[PDB]
Design a protein around this ligand. Structure first.
Ligand SMILES: *N[C@@H](CCCNC(=O)[C@H](*)CCCCCCCCc1ccccc1)C(N)=O
Lengths: 5, 220
């Protein structure tokens, strides 16, 4: 999973 | 529709070569009346399993599930909007919801809990313009080498750049662009005034990229 800043 | 209009607006400014003016007067293109009402403040890409969760600047939360359905929780914490794949919308509440949505509500809460506590709010220093009027949902999104592209159902297109954390919020109804720079300062411009007065190479480059991204959205 990827996240915003 | 909105994307075709946005493409025309961006092409018109880009064709005018705004950075190549004898005297760029970028500040003359600012128009605070065009500041957006909605943008994406944070997001989580769990698309390998469930979908993309996101929060709008009003602290509402949404999920675009992998089955192309959307669930939105308003900032009151109880009101829900469910959008089927057709686009068919249904309004309900967490306190009174069909059991058929329990699993998706549970997934949305996992997203909400994480995002409220642990991610930065994009545009935390931006006050939305005064409005009257509809809460949008995430229509489409994708990621490239340089950015994540978020297309909202009100026509807005948001582009968050990875390398330097700069961001564009494009609205085809206002025909406007909001640019958030690496220092998190922001300005809102009318695109037609950028054509008239020009802008710096940094913004010109991102508007050229934005046109490429709208082409991608148009090709779905
Ligand atoms: N920019 C932040 C720091 C960012 C650190 N990176 C992230 O937070 C990226 C996202 C990490 C994955 C979270 C996945 C969990 C989602 C919740 C969920 C949803 C459905 C089912 C189960 C769980 C900063 N503060 O600077």
């Amino acid at each position: 999973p990827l996240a915003s800043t | 529709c909105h994307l075709s209009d946005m493409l025309q607006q961006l092409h018109s400014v880009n064709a005018s070569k705004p950075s190549e003016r004898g005297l760029v007067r970028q500040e003359e293109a600012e128009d605070p009346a065009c500041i957006p009402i909605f943008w994406v403040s944070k997001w989580v890409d769990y698309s390998d399993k469930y979908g993309l969760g996101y929060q709008l600047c009003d602290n509402s939360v949404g999920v675009l599930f992998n089955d192309s359905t959307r669930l939105i929780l308003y900032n009151d914490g109880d009101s829900l909007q469910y959008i089927e794949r057709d686009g068919t919308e249904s309004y309900l509440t967490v306190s009174s919801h069909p059991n058929s949505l329990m699993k998706k509500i549970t997934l949305l809460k996992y997203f909400r809990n994480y995002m409220s506590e642990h991610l930065l709010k994009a545009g935390a220093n931006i006050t939305p313009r005064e409005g009257d009027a509809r809460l949008p949902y995430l229509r489409t999104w994708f990621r490239t080498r340089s950015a994540i592209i978020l297309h909202l159902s009100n026509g807005s297109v948001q582009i968050n750049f990875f390398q330097d954390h700069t961001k564009l919020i494009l609205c085809p109804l206002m025909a406007a662009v909001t640019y958030i720079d690496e220092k998190r300062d922001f300005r809102t411009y009318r695109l037609s005034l950028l054509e008239e007065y020009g802008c710096c190479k940094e913004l010109a480059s991102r508007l050229r990229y934005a046109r490429t991204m709208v082409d991608k959205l148009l090709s779905s």
